[PDB]
Coordinates of C-alpha atoms and ligand atoms in Angstrom, one line a residue:
Chain E
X1 CA -0.1 -0.4 0.0
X2 CA 1.2 3.4 -1.1
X3 CA -0.2 7.4 -1.2
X4 CA -0.7 8.2 -5.0
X5 CA 2.1 10.9 -6.1
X6 CA -0.4 13.7 -4.9
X7 CA -1.1 12.3 -2.1
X8 CA -5.0 12.0 -2.9
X9 CA -5.8 9.2 -3.5
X10 CA -4.4 5.7 -2.6
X11 CA -3.7 1.9 -3.3
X12 CA -3.1 -1.3 -2.4
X13 CA -2.7 -5.3 -3.7
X14 CA -4.4 -8.2 -2.9
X15 CA -3.2 -11.9 -4.0
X16 CA -6.3 -13.2 -3.5
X17 CA -6.8 -16.3 -1.2
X18 CA -8.1 -20.0 -1.4
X19 CA -10.8 -20.0 1.4
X20 CA -11.3 -15.9 -0.6
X21 CA -12.7 -18.3 -3.3
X22 CA -16.6 -19.2 -4.2
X23 CA -17.4 -21.9 -6.5
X24 CA -16.4 -20.7 -9.5
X25 CA -12.3 -19.9 -7.9
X26 CA -13.0 -16.5 -8.3
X27 CA -13.0 -14.0 -5.1
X28 CA -16.8 -13.8 -3.6
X29 CA -18.8 -10.5 -3.3
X30 CA -18.4 -10.5 0.5
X31 CA -14.3 -10.5 -0.1
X32 CA -14.0 -7.6 -2.8
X33 CA -16.4 -5.4 -0.1
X34 CA -14.2 -6.2 3.1
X35 CA -11.0 -5.8 0.7
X36 CA -12.6 -2.3 0.0
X37 CA -12.8 -1.8 3.5
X38 CA -9.6 -2.4 4.4
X39 CA -7.5 -0.7 1.6
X40 CA -10.3 2.6 3.1
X41 CA -9.0 2.0 6.9
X42 CA -5.2 1.9 5.6
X43 CA -5.8 5.3 3.3
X44 CA -6.9 6.9 6.5
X45 CA -4.0 5.8 8.8
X46 CA -1.1 6.7 5.6
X47 CA -2.5 10.2 6.5
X48 CA -3.0 11.1 10.0
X49 CA -7.0 10.0 10.8
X50 CA -6.9 6.8 12.4
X51 CA -7.6 6.3 15.8
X52 CA -12.0 4.8 13.9
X53 CA -11.1 7.1 10.6
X54 CA -11.5 10.3 12.6
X55 CA -10.8 14.2 12.3
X56 CA -9.7 16.9 15.8
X57 CA -13.1 18.1 15.8
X58 CA -14.7 14.8 15.6
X59 CA -12.5 13.4 18.1
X60 CA -13.6 16.4 20.4
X61 CA -17.9 15.7 19.4
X62 CA -17.5 12.3 19.7
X63 CA -18.2 11.3 16.4
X64 CA -18.1 8.1 14.2
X65 CA -18.3 7.9 10.8
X66 CA -20.3 5.4 9.8
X67 CA -22.3 3.4 6.1
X68 CA -25.2 5.0 4.8
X69 CA -25.2 3.4 1.4
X70 CA -22.8 0.8 -0.1
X71 CA -22.7 0.4 -4.0
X72 CA -21.0 -2.2 -5.9
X73 CA -20.4 -3.2 -9.8
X74 CA -18.7 -6.0 -10.4
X75 CA -17.4 -7.0 -14.8
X76 CA -14.8 -9.7 -13.6
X77 CA -14.3 -11.0 -10.3
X78 CA -10.5 -12.3 -9.2
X79 CA -9.6 -16.2 -9.8
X80 CA -7.5 -17.5 -6.5
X81 CA -3.8 -16.5 -6.9
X82 CA -4.5 -13.7 -8.7
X83 CA -3.0 -10.1 -7.8
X84 CA -6.1 -7.9 -7.4
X85 CA -5.0 -3.5 -7.6
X86 CA -7.6 -1.3 -6.5
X87 CA -7.6 2.9 -5.9
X88 CA -9.4 4.8 -4.0
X89 CA -10.6 8.2 -2.7
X90 CA -12.6 10.1 -0.7
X91 CA -14.5 13.0 -1.6
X92 CA -17.2 15.3 0.8
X93 CA -20.7 16.0 -0.2
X94 CA -21.7 19.1 1.6
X95 CA -23.0 19.3 4.9
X96 CA -25.1 16.2 4.5
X97 CA -21.9 13.8 4.9
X98 CA -18.7 11.9 3.1
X99 CA -18.1 9.3 0.1
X100 CA -15.6 6.9 -0.7
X101 CA -15.2 5.7 -3.7
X102 CA -13.2 2.9 -5.0
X103 CA -11.6 1.6 -8.4
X104 CA -10.9 -2.1 -8.8
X105 CA -8.4 -3.4 -12.1
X106 CA -6.2 -6.3 -13.3
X107 CA -2.8 -5.8 -12.0
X108 CA -1.5 -7.8 -14.8
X109 CA -3.4 -5.9 -17.5
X110 CA -4.6 -2.5 -16.1
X111 CA -8.1 -3.4 -17.3
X112 CA -10.8 -2.2 -15.1
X113 CA -12.5 -5.0 -13.4
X114 CA -15.1 -3.6 -10.5
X115 CA -15.8 -0.3 -9.2
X116 CA -17.9 1.1 -5.7
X117 CA -19.3 3.8 -4.3
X118 CA -20.3 5.0 -1.4
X119 CA -21.9 7.3 1.3
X120 CA -21.4 7.7 5.2
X121 CA -22.7 9.8 7.6
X122 CA -22.1 11.2 11.6
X123 CA -23.0 9.3 13.8
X124 CA -22.6 9.7 18.0
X125 CA -19.9 7.3 19.1
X126 CA -20.9 6.7 22.6
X127 CA -24.9 6.2 22.3
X128 CA -24.3 5.1 18.8
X129 CA -27.8 7.5 17.1
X130 CA -27.0 9.7 13.8
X131 CA -26.3 13.6 14.4
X132 CA -26.1 16.7 12.3
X133 CA -22.7 17.4 10.0
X134 CA -21.7 21.0 10.3
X135 CA -18.6 22.5 8.6
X136 CA -16.7 22.4 11.0
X137 CA -15.2 19.2 10.2
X138 CA -14.5 19.7 6.5
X139 CA -11.7 22.0 5.5
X140 CA -9.2 19.7 8.0
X141 CA -9.5 16.7 5.4
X142 CA -10.6 18.4 2.0
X143 CA -6.8 18.5 1.3
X144 CA -6.4 15.4 1.2
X145 CA -9.0 14.8 -1.4
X146 CA -9.3 15.4 -4.8
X147 CA -10.7 19.0 -5.5
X148 CA -12.2 18.6 -9.4
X149 CA -15.2 16.4 -8.9
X150 CA -14.4 12.9 -9.1
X151 CA -16.7 9.8 -9.0
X152 CA -15.9 6.2 -9.8
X153 CA -19.9 6.9 -10.6
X154 CA -20.2 10.0 -13.5
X155 CA -22.3 8.7 -15.7
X156 CA -26.4 10.7 -15.1
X157 CA -29.3 8.8 -13.4
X158 CA -26.2 6.2 -12.9
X159 CA -28.0 2.7 -10.5
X160 CA -25.7 4.0 -7.8
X161 CA -28.1 7.0 -6.8
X162 CA -31.5 5.4 -7.1
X163 CA -33.9 5.7 -5.0
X164 CA -35.0 2.4 -3.3
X165 CA -38.7 0.8 -2.6
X166 CA -39.6 -1.3 -0.1
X167 CA -40.4 -5.1 0.2
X168 CA -44.7 -6.1 0.4
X169 CA -45.5 -9.4 2.0
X170 CA -44.6 -10.9 1.0
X171 CA -41.8 -12.3 -0.1
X172 CA -41.2 -14.6 -2.8
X173 CA -38.2 -16.1 -0.6
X174 CA -36.7 -15.4 2.5
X175 CA -33.9 -16.8 5.4
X176 CA -35.3 -16.9 8.4
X177 CA -33.1 -17.0 11.6
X178 CA -29.5 -15.0 11.0
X179 CA -27.2 -14.2 13.7
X180 CA -24.0 -12.6 14.1
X181 CA -21.3 -14.8 15.6
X182 CA -17.7 -13.5 16.9
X183 CA -16.2 -13.8 13.6
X184 CA -18.7 -11.4 12.0
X185 CA -18.2 -8.3 14.4
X186 CA -15.2 -5.4 13.8
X187 CA -12.4 -4.1 16.2
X188 CA -15.4 -2.2 18.3
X189 CA -17.5 -5.0 18.7
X190 CA -19.8 -4.0 16.3
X191 CA -21.8 -5.9 13.5
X192 CA -19.1 -5.4 10.1
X193 CA -20.7 -4.4 7.3
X194 CA -20.0 -7.4 4.8
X195 CA -22.4 -8.3 6.8
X196 CA -25.0 -7.5 5.5
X197 CA -24.3 -7.9 2.1
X198 CA -24.1 -12.0 3.3
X199 CA -27.3 -12.2 4.8
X200 CA -28.7 -10.4 2.0
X201 CA -27.6 -12.6 -0.5
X202 CA -28.3 -15.7 1.7
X203 CA -32.5 -15.6 0.6
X204 CA -31.2 -15.6 -3.4
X205 CA -32.0 -19.1 -4.2
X206 CA -28.9 -21.2 -4.6
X207 CA -30.4 -22.5 -8.4
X208 CA -29.7 -18.7 -9.2
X209 CA -25.9 -18.6 -7.6
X210 CA -24.8 -21.8 -9.2
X211 CA -26.3 -20.3 -12.9
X212 CA -25.6 -16.6 -12.7
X213 CA -23.1 -14.3 -11.7
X214 CA -23.4 -11.1 -9.7
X215 CA -23.2 -7.3 -11.8
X216 CA -24.2 -5.0 -9.1
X217 CA -25.5 -4.9 -5.1
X218 CA -26.6 -1.5 -3.6
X219 CA -27.4 -1.3 0.0
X220 CA -29.0 1.1 1.8
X221 CA -28.0 1.2 5.6
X222 CA -31.3 1.9 8.1
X223 CA -30.1 0.9 11.5
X224 CA -27.4 -1.1 12.9
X225 CA -27.8 -5.2 13.9
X226 CA -26.6 -5.9 17.9
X227 CA -24.4 -8.0 18.5
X228 CA -28.2 -10.3 20.5
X229 CA -30.2 -9.3 17.4
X230 CA -32.1 -11.6 14.7
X231 CA -32.4 -10.9 11.2
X232 CA -34.9 -12.3 8.5
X233 CA -34.2 -11.8 4.9
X234 CA -36.4 -11.2 2.3
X235 CA -35.8 -11.0 -1.2
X236 CA -38.8 -11.1 -4.2
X237 CA -37.7 -11.5 -8.2
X238 CA -38.7 -7.6 -9.5
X239 CA -37.6 -8.6 -13.1
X240 CA -30.5 -10.4 -16.0
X241 CA -32.3 -11.3 -13.5
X242 CA -32.9 -8.3 -10.8
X243 CA -34.3 -8.4 -7.3
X244 CA -35.4 -6.5 -4.4
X245 CA -34.4 -7.1 -1.3
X246 CA -34.7 -6.8 3.0
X247 CA -33.1 -6.8 6.1
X248 CA -35.2 -7.0 9.0
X249 CA -35.2 -7.7 12.7
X250 CA -36.7 -11.4 13.3
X251 CA -39.1 -9.9 16.5
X252 CA -40.3 -6.8 15.8
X253 CA -39.8 -6.2 12.6
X254 CA -37.6 -3.4 12.4
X255 CA -35.7 -2.5 9.5
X256 CA -31.9 -2.7 9.3
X257 CA -31.4 -2.7 5.2
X258 CA -32.8 -2.2 1.6
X259 CA -31.5 -3.1 -1.7
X260 CA -31.4 -4.1 -4.9
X261 CA -28.8 -7.0 -7.0
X262 CA -28.6 -7.6 -10.1
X263 CA -27.4 -10.9 -12.2
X264 CA -26.4 -12.4 -15.8
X265 CA -26.6 -15.6 -17.1
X266 CA -23.2 -17.3 -16.8
Chain H
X1 CA 5.2 -17.1 -0.5
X2 CA 8.6 -19.7 -1.8
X3 CA 9.5 -23.6 -0.8
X4 CA 13.0 -23.1 1.4
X5 CA 15.9 -24.3 0.2
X6 CA 15.5 -28.3 0.6
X7 CA 12.1 -27.9 -0.5
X8 CA 10.9 -29.7 2.4
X9 CA 8.7 -27.1 3.7
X10 CA 6.8 -23.8 2.7
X11 CA 7.1 -19.9 3.8
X12 CA 5.2 -17.2 4.1
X13 CA 4.2 -13.0 5.2
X14 CA 0.8 -12.3 6.0
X15 CA 0.2 -8.3 6.8
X16 CA -2.4 -8.5 9.8
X17 CA -6.0 -6.5 7.9
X18 CA -8.4 -4.0 9.8
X19 CA -11.3 -6.7 9.4
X20 CA -9.2 -9.4 10.8
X21 CA -8.8 -8.9 14.4
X22 CA -10.8 -9.0 17.4
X23 CA -11.1 -5.9 20.3
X24 CA -7.5 -5.7 21.7
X25 CA -6.2 -4.8 17.9
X26 CA -4.7 -8.0 17.3
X27 CA -5.8 -11.0 15.1
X28 CA -8.2 -13.2 15.9
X29 CA -7.9 -17.4 16.5
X30 CA -10.2 -17.3 13.5
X31 CA -8.4 -15.7 11.4
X32 CA -4.6 -17.2 12.5
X33 CA -6.7 -20.4 11.6
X34 CA -7.3 -19.6 8.1
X35 CA -3.9 -18.5 7.8
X36 CA -2.8 -21.7 8.5
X37 CA -5.2 -22.9 5.9
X38 CA -4.0 -20.6 3.1
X39 CA 0.1 -21.6 3.7
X40 CA -1.3 -25.0 3.5
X41 CA -3.1 -25.1 0.2
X42 CA 0.1 -22.8 -1.2
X43 CA 2.3 -25.5 -0.2
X44 CA 0.4 -28.8 -2.2
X45 CA 0.1 -26.1 -5.2
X46 CA 4.3 -24.7 -5.5
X47 CA 4.8 -28.9 -5.3
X48 CA 2.4 -30.0 -8.4
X49 CA -0.6 -30.6 -6.4
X50 CA -4.2 -28.6 -7.3
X51 CA -3.3 -31.8 -1.8
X52 CA -4.7 -35.1 -3.7
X53 CA -2.5 -37.0 -5.5
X54 CA -3.1 -38.5 -9.5
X55 CA -4.1 -42.3 -7.1
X56 CA -6.2 -40.5 -5.1
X57 CA -8.2 -38.5 -7.8
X58 CA -8.6 -42.2 -9.4
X59 CA -10.1 -44.0 -6.1
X60 CA -11.9 -40.9 -5.2
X61 CA -10.1 -41.1 -2.1
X62 CA -9.0 -37.4 -0.4
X63 CA -7.5 -35.9 2.6
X64 CA -9.8 -34.6 5.4
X65 CA -9.1 -33.2 9.0
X66 CA -9.4 -35.3 11.9
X67 CA -7.4 -32.4 14.0
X68 CA -6.1 -29.1 15.0
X69 CA -4.2 -28.3 17.7
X70 CA -3.3 -24.8 18.1
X71 CA -1.3 -22.7 21.0
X72 CA -0.7 -19.1 20.9
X73 CA 1.1 -17.2 23.2
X74 CA 1.2 -13.8 21.2
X75 CA -1.7 -13.3 19.2
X76 CA -0.3 -10.2 15.2
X77 CA -1.0 -7.3 16.2
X78 CA -3.5 -5.2 13.4
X79 CA -0.8 -4.4 10.8
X80 CA 1.7 -6.4 11.8
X81 CA 4.1 -8.8 9.4
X82 CA 4.0 -12.7 10.5
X83 CA 5.4 -14.8 9.1
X84 CA 4.7 -18.6 9.1
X85 CA 6.3 -22.1 8.0
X86 CA 4.8 -25.5 7.9
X87 CA 5.8 -28.7 6.1
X88 CA 4.2 -32.1 6.3
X89 CA 4.8 -35.6 8.4
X90 CA 4.1 -39.4 7.3
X91 CA 1.8 -40.9 9.9
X92 CA 2.3 -44.8 8.2
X93 CA -1.2 -46.2 7.1
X94 CA -3.0 -43.8 9.8
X95 CA -2.6 -41.1 7.5
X96 CA -0.4 -37.3 7.9
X97 CA 0.3 -35.0 9.6
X98 CA 0.5 -30.9 9.2
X99 CA 2.6 -28.7 11.2
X100 CA 2.9 -24.8 10.8
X101 CA 5.2 -22.3 13.0
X102 CA 4.6 -19.0 13.7
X103 CA 7.0 -15.8 14.6
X104 CA 7.0 -12.4 14.2
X105 CA 9.0 -11.8 11.4
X106 CA 10.4 -8.7 12.6
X107 CA 12.5 -10.3 15.8
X108 CA 12.4 -14.4 14.2
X109 CA 10.6 -15.4 17.3
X110 CA 7.9 -17.7 17.4
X111 CA 4.7 -16.2 19.0
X112 CA 2.4 -19.7 18.0
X113 CA 2.1 -22.8 16.6
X114 CA -0.1 -25.6 15.6
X115 CA -0.2 -29.0 14.6
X116 CA -3.4 -31.4 12.1
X117 CA -4.0 -35.3 11.7
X118 CA -5.4 -35.8 8.7
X119 CA -7.3 -38.9 7.7
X120 CA -8.0 -40.3 4.4
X121 CA -12.0 -40.6 3.0
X122 CA -13.7 -41.6 0.1
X123 CA -15.6 -39.1 -1.4
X124 CA -19.1 -40.8 -1.9
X125 CA -19.0 -43.1 0.9
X126 CA -17.7 -40.8 3.5
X127 CA -15.8 -43.9 4.8
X128 CA -12.9 -43.2 5.7
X129 CA -9.8 -45.0 5.7
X130 CA -6.1 -46.6 5.8
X131 CA -2.9 -45.1 3.6
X132 CA -2.5 -47.9 0.8
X133 CA 1.5 -47.9 0.3
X134 CA 1.1 -46.8 -3.3
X135 CA -0.5 -43.8 -2.1
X136 CA 2.2 -43.6 0.6
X137 CA 4.9 -43.7 -1.7
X138 CA 3.4 -40.5 -3.7
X139 CA 4.0 -38.2 -0.6
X140 CA 6.9 -39.0 1.1
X141 CA 9.1 -37.4 -1.0
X142 CA 7.9 -33.8 -0.1
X143 CA 8.6 -34.8 4.0
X144 CA 11.4 -34.1 5.9
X145 CA 13.2 -37.6 6.5
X146 CA 14.5 -36.7 10.0
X147 CA 10.3 -36.0 11.7
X148 CA 10.5 -32.6 12.1
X149 CA 7.3 -31.9 15.1
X150 CA 6.0 -28.4 16.4
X151 CA 5.2 -29.9 19.1
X152 CA 7.5 -32.4 21.0
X153 CA 7.3 -32.7 23.9
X154 CA 6.4 -36.4 25.8
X155 CA 2.9 -35.5 27.1
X156 CA 1.6 -33.0 25.3
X157 CA -1.6 -31.8 25.1
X158 CA -1.9 -31.8 21.3
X159 CA -2.2 -36.0 21.8
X160 CA -4.3 -35.8 24.9
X161 CA -7.9 -37.7 24.8
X162 CA -10.8 -35.8 24.6
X163 CA -13.9 -36.5 26.8
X164 CA -17.9 -36.3 25.5
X165 CA -19.6 -33.5 27.4
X166 CA -22.2 -34.5 29.9
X167 CA -25.7 -32.8 29.4
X168 CA -26.9 -30.4 30.7
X169 CA -24.1 -28.2 29.9
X170 CA -23.1 -25.3 31.7
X171 CA -23.0 -23.2 29.0
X172 CA -25.3 -22.9 25.2
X173 CA -25.4 -21.3 21.9
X174 CA -28.3 -22.9 20.0
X175 CA -29.2 -22.8 16.4
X176 CA -26.1 -21.9 14.6
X177 CA -26.3 -22.4 11.1
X178 CA -24.2 -22.1 8.1
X179 CA -24.2 -18.7 5.7
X180 CA -21.9 -18.9 1.5
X181 CA -19.5 -16.9 3.6
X182 CA -18.9 -20.0 5.5
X183 CA -18.5 -22.6 2.8
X184 CA -14.5 -23.6 0.7
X185 CA -14.5 -23.4 -3.3
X186 CA -16.0 -27.1 -3.0
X187 CA -19.5 -26.3 -1.1
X188 CA -18.5 -27.7 2.3
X189 CA -18.4 -25.9 5.8
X190 CA -14.4 -24.7 6.0
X191 CA -13.0 -25.8 8.9
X192 CA -12.2 -22.5 11.0
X193 CA -16.5 -22.1 11.2
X194 CA -16.1 -25.1 14.1
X195 CA -13.9 -22.9 15.4
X196 CA -15.8 -19.9 15.5
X197 CA -19.3 -22.4 16.2
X198 CA -17.2 -23.9 18.8
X199 CA -16.2 -20.2 21.1
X200 CA -19.7 -19.2 20.5
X201 CA -20.7 -20.8 23.5
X202 CA -18.1 -19.6 26.1
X203 CA -19.3 -16.5 27.6
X204 CA -18.7 -12.4 26.8
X205 CA -16.8 -12.2 29.9
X206 CA -14.3 -14.7 29.7
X207 CA -13.4 -13.7 26.1
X208 CA -13.0 -9.9 27.0
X209 CA -10.9 -10.7 30.8
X210 CA -9.1 -13.9 29.3
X211 CA -6.5 -14.6 26.4
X212 CA -6.8 -17.6 24.6
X213 CA -4.1 -19.9 25.0
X214 CA -4.3 -23.5 24.0
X215 CA -7.2 -24.7 20.9
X216 CA -7.7 -28.7 20.6
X217 CA -10.6 -29.6 18.2
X218 CA -11.5 -33.5 17.4
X219 CA -13.4 -33.5 13.6
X220 CA -16.1 -36.8 13.7
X221 CA -18.6 -35.4 11.4
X222 CA -19.1 -32.9 9.1
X223 CA -21.9 -30.4 9.0
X224 CA -24.0 -29.9 5.8
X225 CA -25.4 -26.8 4.1
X226 CA -28.9 -27.2 5.9
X227 CA -27.6 -28.3 9.0
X228 CA -28.2 -26.1 12.1
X229 CA -25.7 -26.8 14.8
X230 CA -26.0 -25.8 18.9
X231 CA -22.2 -25.6 20.5
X232 CA -21.8 -26.2 24.2
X233 CA -19.7 -25.7 27.0
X234 CA -18.8 -26.5 30.5
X235 CA -15.5 -25.1 32.5
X236 CA -13.4 -28.5 33.5
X237 CA -11.0 -25.7 35.9
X238 CA -5.9 -17.1 36.7
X239 CA -5.9 -19.9 34.0
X240 CA -9.4 -21.1 32.3
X241 CA -9.7 -25.1 30.6
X242 CA -13.1 -25.4 29.1
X243 CA -14.8 -28.4 27.5
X244 CA -17.0 -28.3 24.2
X245 CA -19.1 -30.2 22.1
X246 CA -20.7 -29.4 18.6
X247 CA -23.8 -31.1 17.5
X248 CA -27.1 -31.0 15.3
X249 CA -30.2 -30.0 16.3
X250 CA -32.2 -32.8 14.4
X251 CA -30.8 -35.3 16.8
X252 CA -27.5 -34.8 18.6
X253 CA -25.2 -36.2 16.5
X254 CA -22.0 -35.2 17.3
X255 CA -19.6 -32.9 14.9
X256 CA -17.3 -32.2 16.9
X257 CA -15.3 -32.3 20.8
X258 CA -12.7 -29.9 22.1
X259 CA -11.3 -28.4 25.0
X260 CA -9.7 -24.6 25.2
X261 CA -7.4 -23.3 28.1
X262 CA -7.2 -19.5 28.3
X263 CA -5.3 -17.6 30.7
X264 CA -5.7 -13.2 32.3
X265 CA -4.7 -10.5 30.6
Ligands
YEB301 C1 -8.7 12.1 4.2 N1 -8.7 10.5 5.1 C2 -7.7 9.6 3.7 S1 -10.2 10.0 5.1 O1 -11.1 9.5 4.0 O2 -9.7 8.5 5.2 N2 -11.1 10.9 6.1 C3 -12.1 11.7 5.4 C4 -12.5 12.6 6.8 O3 -13.1 11.8 7.3 C5 -11.6 11.1 8.1 C6 -10.3 11.0 7.4
YEB302 C1 3.7 -32.6 -0.1 N1 2.8 -31.4 0.1 C2 3.1 -29.8 0.5 S1 1.2 -31.6 1.0 O1 2.3 -31.9 1.8 O2 0.4 -31.5 0.4 N2 0.9 -33.8 0.4 C3 1.4 -34.5 1.8 C4 -0.2 -35.3 1.7 O3 -0.6 -36.1 0.2 C5 -0.5 -35.5 -0.8 C6 -0.2 -33.8 -0.4

């Protein structure tokens, strides 16, 4: 890992591991999600913003960054043993939050094999509840960001900004009774964001996963799943195959996540 | 990763990832288990395998884990480089062994060690079997000839018989199921999943105030994709010892049994 020449982005190479791949000997979308999160964490560390990726006024008001939206598009999943180079950068979205974008490339050819975008909001670190975003904690990190607009999804009306509807009962498919284990928690005993992607895909029938490849995943994070919570994952086909997804707590039916996935025949 | 000079062992360096660590900002025992499995995989690849010999493919025979023993003196911190050395040894008709030594890359100090017992099984019938002399000669050329042991000790805890837990268990985690992330490239539950499931019945107060030093785990049967497992634990003991039992909900069929040793932070 190393910051690029202008110090406005970070790049890192990963060799795909035997246990990180699926039945097609290529990296799963959850492995990709963890690789995106790891290169995000090393970019914050390399510029002096790690203690959580936080700024000086955030540390004082006790605010942390939390994911509100994750959008990934994969054109080619890396094979077991292949080297994948990822480039990451951040940009402010005014006083509404921040964005982190990624570009995945094949190290051998330099060809783009995927791309991601994420929306981040402020949250009180002690209570774990959402709080406003002010310009007080804005100028302190914008010098480590590209100045002109730079997006992984620049195109007008692109899939990453599409409004997601809420799934109406009954769901076509479901996986009920999902619970997090210690391996699903992060260093601060909180459920890893990549877990929710896995839980979302659990309600997709195996026949689909065996005959199709996942091209697009958009996921909105409404509420976090606590260590002792139990989640149901619901899916209904809306179509290439398209699915509408809903993660909710088993007891009260409180929404934790909503999303959409797009799959293509192999 | 690279085979050592005599081509009788393999070494690899791993940089610890942000998502691979626990509450102490050090690698979890499951992360270590996956690192052991990955360096095992690359050692088999570097010598010609894709760990099945030519004669084993014809007879529909695979290697399966029967025991896993890990001792950790120091878990690597997030960002640290951990060097692992792995090798294999024959166990005659019984099966094979794969050992590991974990070291700090900066000091060369041993921070942990592991051992594993492997047995031959027919893929179709699931029935375990003794190693024939034809198969034995194929892999014996890749093992050190003067046996190398990770656990040399005359009465090492890696060879101790593990009893079966009697109901009622002191503690339990009920209704554990595998998700797709828990499966390997052949749609089978990863061996590291069972370690995680075993540790789920350990109370959080113990995990927060103690560090895991030793884990021995016997693999009796495998959990299929649609199975549901219960994890049982009873304290048997500064140092804490636990007896573990993983079993299916549907009938109470044993899949794993084990022991863990923890020490106050
Ligand atoms: C500038 N960094 C690399 S950052 O994107 O990680 N981050 C921006 C805002 O939050 C604090 C740090
Ligand atoms: C020689 N390899 C690295 S090995 O240890 O994977 N090997 C021994 C067991 O049977 C065949 C495969």
